[PDB]
C-alpha cells in the first residue's frame, strides 16, 4: 500500500485549503477545508480539518502515511519572494499537520510539488486517458499563470509557461471585482457574461494570436516586490485600464447598517447587471485567449485529448466551446480544477513517483464525509423537528420535485469542488418555467440573472444532449437536442446551452434511482440541481449544516440520509 496525503493551504496569504488521501492510487478521502470550517474559500490556514477527516475516514494516522505532499513549491516561494525558507521539514510538518491534531512518532517524507505540476497531475492522472495535451490556466503558480505541457507514459513534461503578470485568471477576477461581483466570485461574472453583448473582445489590452494572446497593457515581467504573487500589480493595471476604456467606473462596495438585519451589511453602489457588456466582453476575451493556448499545446504535442486545470478551468462556458473546437476530440477537466485540486494533484504526483498507478476519478466527486442513519438521527433529534423515514425516499422525493417543490438532498459522501452533484444539492423541477425565479429570488434571495443546471441519467443524455459523453461534474457546457430545448426551461438557456451532470447508477445509486422515479412522472429523468447553501456559506457538509440551512430558507423538504423532513406548515 502506498498512502499519500496531499495538502493545500498554509496560514499565510493562502486560499482553497484542502486535503486528499490516496491509498494504492485510489482516492480514499478528499475534502475542502471550507466545508468543515464553514468558512468560505479556506483562507489562511493549513487544511487541518480536511486532513483530520481524511485520516479518520481511512482509519489512519500520520505514521501510516508513506508521504505528505503539498501542492506548491513553498520553499521556492519563500526563497524568491520572502528572502528565504526558514522551516525544516519537521517545522513545516508541524504547521501543515499540527501535532495537537496529528500525533506522530516520526516525520513522514515531505514533498513540495510545483503548483502547476500539481494542477496538471489532478487532471492527467485521474482522466482515465493515457496521454494528452495539458493546459494549466491559473491565477498564478509560484511564477507562471499558464503552463503548457505534454502528458504521456505517466509523465508530465512542460513545454512552455506564461509569467504571472499576464494572468488570465487574475484578469477575470479583477473584472469580476470591478463589476462589484467580487474577485472571489468569478463564477458570477461568467453567469453575468451570458446576458451581455461583446463589443471589442480585445478590451484594448489583449492581442490574440493562433498560439494564445499578448497583453501589451502589462510588462510580462512585472512583479510585486512586496508580495509573492502579481495580483496587486495586475489589479492596479486592470482597474486603471478598465476605468479608461469602459463607460462605467469601478462598482464600489458599500458597508451600511441595515436595521432590518441588525448588522452592517455589504452591498454594491451599482447593480452589477449594469456591467453585463463588460462581463460578456471579458468572457469573450478569456475564451479567445484560451482557444489559442489550447490549439497551441494540442498542435505542439500532437494530441487530440485536452486536459485543463487551474482556476480558469472552472469556466464551464469556455470549456464547452473548447470541447466543440475542431482541434479537440476528448477533454477531461477534473471537478477540482481550481487550487483545491492541488492537494490531490500533489498526492498523485508523489504516489506516481513512488510507483503507484492512479485510478480514474470515474464519474464521481463524492469523496467527502458521509454520515450514517444514527448520526443523521442524532442531528435531527437536536432540532426537535418531526420527521419521517419513507419506505421509498427516492420515489417520494421524485414526486415532490415533480410537483414543483424544492428539496434539500443530503446523501452519502459530500462532493468535492464547487458544484453540487447529488450528494449536497437543492433539487427542483427542470421542467418548470417559474422554478428559476423561485429559487433565485424566493429560495436563495439572490440575483435574478443566475443560471441553473440539470442533473440527468447518463442513460438518457445521448437523447437530451447533442454530445454522447459523460458530463459528471457540471464543469462543461454543451447543447441540448431540439426535442429537449423547450421541455427544460429552468435548466436550459435560450440558445439551448446547458451545464449538465450526467449520473450513472454506479456513481450514485440513490440519486440515480430518484432521477429514474422522476422520469416516470415528468417524462424525463432530469432535474434542476443547484448547490445546497446560499450565498453566505459553503455547500452544507454535515446533517446539522443541512438542517440549519433547511431551517433558514423557504425550502419545502429535506431528504437527509433515509429521513424526510418537510416544512413545519402547521400554525
Binding site residue list for carbamoyl phosphate:
419-420, 499, 529-531
Of Fe ion, K ion, none, which one sits near residue 161, judging by CB under 5 to 8 A according to partner kind? none
Please give the Cα distance from 64 to 273 (Å, whole number).
52
Q: How far is the CB of 11 from Fe ion (least distance, A)?
A: 18
C-alpha to C-alpha distances, 57 to 49, 126, 357, 480, nearest whole angstrom: 12, 21, 21, 39
Q: Out of 100, 226, 495, 568, name the contact with K ion by CB under 5 A.
A: 568
Total number of residues binding Fe ion (CB under 5 A)?
A: 2
Residue among 235 and 339 whose Cβ is closer to Fe ion: 339
Of K ion, Fe ion, none, which one sits near residue 566, judging by CB under 5 to 8 A according to partner kind? K ion
Residue 134: strand, helix, or coil: strand
Q: How far is the CB of 385 from K ion (least distance, A)?
A: 7
Residue 429: strand, helix, or coil: strand
**Rule CB under 5 A: which of 311-370 touch K ion?**
328
Cell of 375: 448520526
267 forms beta bridges with 254
8 A C-beta contact, residue 360 and residue 507: no
Of Fe ion, K ion, none, which one sits near residue 568, judging by CB under 5 to 8 A according to partner kind? K ion
Residue among 66 and 339 whose Cβ is closer to Fe ion: 339
Query: What single DSSP character describes residue 388?
Result: B
545 forms beta bridges with none
Question: Whose grid coordinates read 470591478?
Answer: 178
Q: How many C-beta neighbours within 10 Å does residue 359 have?
A: 14
The yes or no reply on residue 339 touching Fe ion (CB under 5 A) is yes
Residue 363: strand, helix, or coil: coil
Work out the burial of residue 345: count CB atoms within 10 Å of its CB; fewer than 13 is exposed, 13-18 middle, 19 or more buried. buried
Q: How far is the CB of 477 from K ion (least distance, A)?
A: 14
Contact region for Fe ion (CB under 5 A) — 37-45, 134-142, 197-205, 543-551?
134-142
Total number of residues binding K ion (CB under 5 A)?
A: 3
Q: How far is the CB of 569 from K ion (least distance, A)?
A: 7
CA angle 114, 116, 118 (to 5 degrees): 70
Residue among 115 and 377 whose Cβ is closer to Fe ion: 115
Residue among 230 and 339 whose Cβ is closer to Fe ion: 339
Q: Where does 438-496 have alpha helices with state H?
A: 458-464
Annotated binding site for Fe cation: 115, 119, 138, 339
- E strand or H helix at 187: helix 186-193
Residue among 459 and 566 whose Cβ is closer to K ion: 566
Question: Whose grid coordinates read 452533484?
Answer: 421
Q: Out of 33, 73, 129, 138, name the contact with Fe ion by CB under 5 A.
A: 138
Q: How many C-beta neighbours within 10 Å does residue 29 have?
A: 24
Q: How far is the CB of 322 from K ion (least distance, A)?
A: 9
**Rule CB under 5 A: which of 440-499 touch K ion?**
none
Cell of 360: 480514474
Choosing from 15, 111, 150, 512, which is the catalytic residue? 15
8 A C-beta contact, residue 181 and residue 283: no
Of Fe ion, K ion, none, which one sits near residue 138, judging by CB under 5 to 8 A according to partner kind? Fe ion
Residue among 290 and 328 whose Cβ is closer to K ion: 328
Q: How far is the CB of 141 from Fe ion (least distance, A)?
A: 6
Is 15 labeled as catalytic in the residue annotation? Answer: yes
503 forms beta bridges with 457
Query: What single DSSP character describes residue 275?
Result: G
Residues at the site binding K ion, with contacts judged by CB under 5 A: 328, 566, 568
Residues at the site binding Fe ion, with contacts judged by CB under 5 A: 138, 339
What residues are labeled active site? 15
Amino acid at each position: 500500500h502506498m498512502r499519500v496525503l496531499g495538502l493545500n493551504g498554509w496560514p499565510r496569504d493562502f486560499h482553497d485549503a484542502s486535503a486528499a488521501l490516496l491509498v494504492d492510487g485510489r482516492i480514499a478521502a478528499f475534502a475542502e477545508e471550507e466545508r468543515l470550517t464553514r468558512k468560505k474559500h479556506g483562507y489562511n490556514t493549513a487544511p487541518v480539518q480536511a486532513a483530520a477527516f481524511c485520516l479518520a475516514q481511512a482509519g489512519l494516522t500520520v505514521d501510516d502515511l508513506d508521504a505528505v505532499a503539498f501542492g506548491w513549491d513553498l520553499p521556492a516561494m519563500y526563497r524568491e519572494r520572502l528572502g528565504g525558507w526558514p522551516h525544516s521539514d519537521s517545522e513545516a510538518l508541524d504547521i501543515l499537520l499540527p501535532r495537537d491534531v496529528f500525533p506522530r512518532r516520526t516525520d513522514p517524507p515531505l514533498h513540495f510539488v510545483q503548483h502547476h505540476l500539481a494542477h496538471a497531475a489532478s487532471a492527467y492522472y485521474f482522466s482515465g486517458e493515457d496521454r494528452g495535451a495539458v493546459l494549466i490556466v491559473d491565477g498564478q503558480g509560484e511564477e507562471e499563470c499558464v503552463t503548457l505541457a505534454h502528458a504521456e507514459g505517466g509523465k508530465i513534461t512542460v513545454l512552455d509557461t506564461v509569467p504571472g503578470a499576464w494572468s488570465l485568471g487574475f484578469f477575470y477576477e479583477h473584472v469580476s471585482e470591478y463589476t462589484g461581483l467580487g474577485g472571489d466570485n468569478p463564477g458570477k461574472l461568467m453567469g453575468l457574461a451570458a446576458h451581455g453583448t461583446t463589443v471589442d473582445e480585445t478590451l484594448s489590452a489583449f492581442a490574440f494570436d493562433s498560439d494564445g494572446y499578448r497583453l501589451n497593457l502589462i510588462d510580462p515581467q512585472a512583479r510585486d516586490p512586496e508580495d509573492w504573487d502579481e495580483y496587486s500589480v495586475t489589479e492596479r493595471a486592470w482597474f486603471a485600464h478598465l476605468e479608461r476604456i469602459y463607460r462605467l467606473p469601478p462598482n464600489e462596495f458599500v458597508r451600511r447598517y441595515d436595521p432590518a438585519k441588525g448588522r452592517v451589511v455589504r452591498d454594491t453602489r451599482r447593480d452589477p447587471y449594469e456591467y453585463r457588456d463588460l462581463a460578456a466582453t471579458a468572457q469573450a476575451a478569456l475564451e479567445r485567449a484560451v482557444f489559442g493556448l489550447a490549439d497551441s499545446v494540442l498542435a505542439r504535442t500532437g494530441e487530440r485529448t485536452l486536459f485543463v486545470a487551474g482556476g480558469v478551468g472552472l469556466n464551464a462556458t469556455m470549456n464547452g466551446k473548447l470541447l466543440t473546437r475542431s482541434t479537440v476530440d476528448k477533454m477531461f477537466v477534473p471537478p477540482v480544477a481550481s487550487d483545491i485540486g492541488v492537494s490531490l494533484g500533489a498526492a498523485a504526483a508523489v504516489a506516481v513517483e513512488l510507483g503507484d498507478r492512479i485510478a480514474p476519478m470515474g464519474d464521481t466527486a463524492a469523496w467527502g464525509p458521509e454520515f450514517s442513519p444514527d448520526q443523521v438521527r442524532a442531528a435531527l433529534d437536536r432540532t426537535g423537528l418531526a420527521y419521517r423515514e419513507p419506505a421509498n425516499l427516492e420515489r417520494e422525493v421524485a414526486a415532490l420535485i415533480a410537483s414543483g417543490k424544492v428539496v434539500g438532498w443530503a446523501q452519502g459522501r459530500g462532493e468535492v469542488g464547487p458544484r453540487a452533484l447529488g450528494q449536497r444539492s437543492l433539487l427542483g423541477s427542470a421542467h418548470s418555467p417559474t422554478m428559476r425565479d423561485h429559487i433565485n429570488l424566493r429560495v436563495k434571495d439572490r440575483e435574478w440573472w443566475r443560471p441553473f443546471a440539470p442533473s440527468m441519467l447518463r442513460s438518457v443524455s445521448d437523447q437530451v444532449l447533442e454530445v454522447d459523453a459523460d458530463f459528471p461534474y457540471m464543469i462543461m457546457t454543451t447543447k441540448v437536442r431540439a426535442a429537449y430545448a423547450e421541455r427544460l426551461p429552468s435548466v436550459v438557456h435560450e440558445d439551448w446551452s446547458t451545464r449538465p451532470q450526467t449520473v450513472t447508477e454506479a456513481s450514485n445509486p440513490r440519486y440515480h434511482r430518484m432521477l429514474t422515479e422522476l422520469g416516470d412522472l415528468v417524462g424525463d429523468p432530469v432535474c434542476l440541481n443547484t448547490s445546497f447553501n446560499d450565498r453566505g456559506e459553503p455547500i452544507v457538509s454535515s446533517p446539522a449544516d443541512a438542517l440549519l440551512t433547511f431551517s433558514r430558507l423557504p425550502i419545502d423538504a429535506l431528504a437527509v440520509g433515509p429521513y424526510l423532513v418537510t416544512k413545519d406548515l402547521r400554525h
